[model samples]
Target: AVDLDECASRSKSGEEDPQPQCQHLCHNYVGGYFCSCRPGYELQEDRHSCQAE
Candidate 1:
């Protein structure tokens, strides 16, 4: 089966869940995904949310 690009699909325009999965940044890879934080921020323990550093 072909792997779906969660990042591309979710980040597309007019997505149903407009809210970002990652609080700061999101990186998607084949068969999985990950979250990251922007400058001055850090990833939370959950690994999906971001917290101010």
Candidate 2:
């Protein structure tokens, strides 16, 4: 199994901001992972932010 931490250590922004900056949540998928929004929220244009749903 892939280590969630090492596998998705960085977000889309990369080195400038390696850590995942999801406003609500972050998830690890098969090959990699992605940031997700919590309840009542939706991902924003930045792909790192979550707005009111």
Show how many residue pairs clash in every candidate, following the order shown.
0, 0
CA shift of 29, model 2, Å: 1.1
Screening candidate 1 with a backbone cut-off below 3 angstroms (N, C-alpha, C), the clashing residue pairs are none
Give the per-residue lDDT of model 1 (tens digit) for 1-53: 36665655654544455344577777878776678888888887777668786
Question: Which structure among the candidates has the greatest lDDT?
Answer: 1
The CA lDDT at 16 in model 1 is 56
Question: C-alpha displacement of 41 in model 1, angstroms?
Answer: 0.5
Candidate 1 residues lying further than 4 Å off, grouped into runs, are: 8-20
On the 0 to 100 scale, the lDDT of residue 30 in model 1 is 76
Alpha-carbon TM-score of each model against the true structure:
0.58, 0.56
